[PDB]
Design a protein around this ligand. Structure first.
Ligand SMILES: *[C@@H]1O[C@H](CO)[C@@H](O)[C@H](O)[C@H]1NC(C)=O
Lengths: 219, 217, 192, 213, 213
């Protein structure tokens, strides 16, 4: 059971230099070729290149030839994917795939690395309540939620009752606004008879901005 | 570059039924006289890295259930899921490793074909807290519907709205295999308080006629 | 019936690259898990096949090619490569389906030695998987050589120094090349 | 006997193309390793390319992707095609017979490749009159480009004491040359001295007569 | 890329002595070294291959030694000529590299230069430029100083020097100092002098001429 572990998420401004890592562990690893796959948001998988750690033989895809540099360090069993100058077109999630040969399928995959290149700066989210009312009830069930707006970068974790309320929750994927910031909405369906008995609070956490907001939603 | 093309782009198969995905190769995917096609299938669940299911068009990775089957020869290949289960919802890719330029397929989205369920539609006026900031957001919620195809149109005083709405869709639910959609109508507070009626119109297969949720400022 | 992999890899001495040994392996169950998952290999490059899934496949025949070369020349044991060894001593086809295994052998094959040879002169490149053991004097001119070294007449074989004081690139490297055959004849080399 | 004669060198603008030939005798070209070695003016020797007996070709990094080495068995000649030429490539290129990609046991006479945006110009020869036992005189070869220029005295009759100095690049971008001889006094007047200057790149041949003024 | 360092950068000895040249490498090459001799105006000639094996026709007085990183070329009974730029080349790891060279020059008795000065020719003066040439013929050692004094004013920045190699007959160097002036500047001065300092001269020797005389 060979495993590949990549580096953490990267957020960089355009024009910077980035170097992400991919370390593998496993007895049968001298045979394993390490490649790189790019997956742009909402799109398919794109193969960038491959390197054999033993002799650092690197074969690049023509679409990525010269655009990126693939390196290796057999001493620490790590592979690298480095950009000289980052462009906003490089906002994508990058996987490293391991295969026990060239022209063989890639069996071992890493967890992935998220690279968000943008000219925007870190900004805390603004949390507003979606009040449950006669316009938000289905007779026996009432729909309420929280609106998370104008934050950067990803991700934002939203929980209800500090993780206690989980059934019937829906946290929508973040949408990128033209302002360069993200917006997100999370809603929960709860019985309409509990609008007074229970207190519904959404917990929005933005680790990059250290923004912890606990907004109480009430009719 | 050997262009890999898949069909269909999206597939809806009911639970326990057979799912078939095709993959068309521009060239041959043979590496030598082995007569073995150097073609593989990958499964990627949402938020998950790709997982190799079938390689050499016939051999399955260790641990892959028997319901997955691969077949084909030459330039035509097919991936078959004999009995679809709730855990088979993912995006499936076909990748060739014959030539050095490795090429993946466009990707096929596989969803569980459940019964038609009408959406539950709710509308939310902007909060007073947000109103202080100078921008007003009106959110329309489409909850627990199938299929995913749904039309949302914003009308303000019976005037269609364009360029100030963004939609977001959740993935298929594990339990009910439904979808949830949220359309957000963003406006400045100056323009928000120039009108009265904010209506959200929803069209779906599960609706005999379009429903409209509205409120007065 | 265990496949004699240990005879090839763990051989007391290896053959020179110009006269590389080939071991034909048939009618045995092959346990490659003894081979890989064992470290001590500085280079384990596989082409077209995966050693991980080698224990559940059936091949008609398996070939194990053994020779000793310098570390600098290990890269020449690869499809599409060119050099003194890839052209005149040992050539791999561009569609090579197998693994190339090498490891440093400065302890064993280096003597403070002068026994491992390679072909230095040849009029044409080697076809894939071709063995040439000719010691005939190479004729570099129009004058026939009559089997005696001299002007425009060179011995086609040269010997590696293989001194332990040399650099890593000059150190001897035992190389074993695994070639897998899948003829229509009934398969005789399988695994567990 | 082994002969290696080279040709094809000369002035070429940067970014141009140049091809040099190396006629070979005394051995078969198709059966031997052949290499091109260049020597920058006043610098060391640099290996450029090699062609194996089996036809394999290998190039140095500084010329990889720009230089191509080839042979013609039917003409027993080794070729070196120099494309995408640069000013830094300006050097004297030698044709050497390689022994198994190890060392060069026979070398060609060498031909100079000059890569500059300058234009060829013919030389001007001026007499150097002797001053009023032993007397000295010479000729001044000034403002020519590119190298080289060959000088002779009395069509090769006078060869003793003929000192031809190395050319020096002047501030104008053109080379200058002086060649002098040391003829004993009282030989002036009885013997007439003429210096034969040849500049093959400009196809200039001047036989200027130097007389004691 | 293995780099070869040669010491000394230049060595001078009298005929009949023994010259020792050292070639040190960045990394061990295991006796895969070659030695060459390159006389001025000639191609490199193979001397010793394998760091110990003399080539065909090489006299026994040449000898090679050493292995690994340190190498030594020893030449005994130094005759006339036999002095050139000697290069060591390694062929242990690609790419093959040469040494920077070790120039060799013979020694002889200290000989004073024969100083001659040449006024510019009238033909050249018609072109608008004047060239004054000072000759230092058949001197040893090579080190010499030439200064141009015009009307007892030292001239700098408008003169160039060129020196030949050792003469075959008597191992004597020769230097030419050339002064470049426009025609107008040449007419504005009367006396042009050339002052020479050398080991073979007790006092600086000055040769001068007056314009129009
Ligand atoms: C060779 O000996 C080693 C120990 O030095 C052993 O682990 C290995 O299994 C042997 N080789 C093979 C091919 O079995």
């Amino acid at each position: 059971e060979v495993q590949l572990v990549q580096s953490g998420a990267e957020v960089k401004k355009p024009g910077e230099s980035l170097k992400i890592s991919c370390k593998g562990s496993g007895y049968i690893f001298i045979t394993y070729w390490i490649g790189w796959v790019r997956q742009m948001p909402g799109k398919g998988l794109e193969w960038m290149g491959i390197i054999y750690p033993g002799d650092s033989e690197t074969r690049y895809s023509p679409s990525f030839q010269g655009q990126v540099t693939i390196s290796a360090d057999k001493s620490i069993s790590t592979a690298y994917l480095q950009w000289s100058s980052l462009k906003a077109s490089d906002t994508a999630m990058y996987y490293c795939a391991g295969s026990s040969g060239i022209f063989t399928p890639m069996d071992v995959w890493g967890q992935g690395t998220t690279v968000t290149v943008s000219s925007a700066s870190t900004k805390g989210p603004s949390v507003f309540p979606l009040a449950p009312s006669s316009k938000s009830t289905s007779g026996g069930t009432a729909a309420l939620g929280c609106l998370v707006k104008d934050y950067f970068p990803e991700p934002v974790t939203v929980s209800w009752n500090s993780g206690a309320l989980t059934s019937g929750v829906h946290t929508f994927p973040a949408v990128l606004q033209s302002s360069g910031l993200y917006s997100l909405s999370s809603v929960v369906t709860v019985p309409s008879s509990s609008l007074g008995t229970q207190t519904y609070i959404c917990n929005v956490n933005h680790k990059p901005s250290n923004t912890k907001v606990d907004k109480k939603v009430e009719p | 570059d050997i262009v890999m093309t898949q069909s269909p782009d999206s597939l809806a198969v009911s639970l326990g039924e057979r799912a078939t995905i095709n993959c068309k190769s521009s060239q041959s995917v043979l590496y030598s006289s082995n007569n073995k096609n150097y073609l593989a299938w990958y499964q990627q669940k949402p938020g998950q890295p790709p997982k190799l299911l079938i390689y050499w068009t016939s051999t399955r990775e260790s641990g892959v259930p028997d319901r997955f089957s691969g077949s084909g020869s030459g330039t035509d290949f097919t991936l078959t899921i004999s009995s679809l289960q709730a855990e088979d919802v993912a995006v499936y890719y076909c990748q060739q490793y014959s030539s050095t330029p490795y090429t993946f397929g466009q990707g096929t989205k596989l969803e569980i074909k459940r019964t038609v369920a009408a959406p539950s539609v709710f509308i939310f006026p902007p909060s007073d807290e947000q109103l202080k900031s100078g921008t007003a957001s009106v959110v329309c919620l489409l909850n627990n519907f199938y299929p995913r195809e749904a039309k949302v149109q914003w009308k303000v005083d019976n005037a269609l709205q364009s360029g100030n709405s963004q939609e977001s869709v959740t993935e298929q639910d594990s339990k009910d295999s439904t979808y949830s959609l949220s359309s957000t109508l963003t406006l400045s507070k100056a323009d928000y308080e120039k009108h009265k009626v904010y209506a959200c119109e929803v069209t779906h297969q599960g609706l005999s006629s379009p429903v409209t949720k509205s409120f007065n400022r | 019936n265990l496949c004699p992999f240990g005879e090839v890899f763990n051989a007391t001495r290896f053959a020179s690259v110009y006269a590389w040994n080939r071991k034909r392996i048939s009618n045995c169950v092959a346990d490659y898990s003894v081979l890989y998952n064992s470290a001590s290999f500085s280079t384990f490059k596989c082409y077209g096949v995966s050693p991980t899934k080698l224990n559940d496949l059936c091949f008609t025949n398996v070939y194990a090619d053994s020779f000793v070369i310098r570390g600098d020349e290990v890269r020449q044991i690869a499809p599409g490569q060119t050099g003194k060894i890839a052209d005149y001593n040992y050539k791999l086809p561009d569609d090579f389906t197998g693994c190339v295994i090498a490891w440093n052998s400065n302890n064993l094959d280096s003597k403070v030695n002068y026994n491992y040879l390679y072909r230095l002169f040849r009029k044409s490149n080697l076809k894939p998987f071709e063995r040439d053991i000719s010691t005939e004097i190479y004729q570099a001119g129009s004058t026939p050589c009559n089997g005696v070294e001299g002007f425009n007449c060179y011995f086609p074989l040269q010997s590696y120094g293989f001194q332990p004081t040399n650099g890593v690139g000059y150190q001897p490297y035992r190389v074993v090349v695994l070639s897998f055959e899948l003829l229509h004849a009934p398969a005789t080399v399988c695994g567990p």
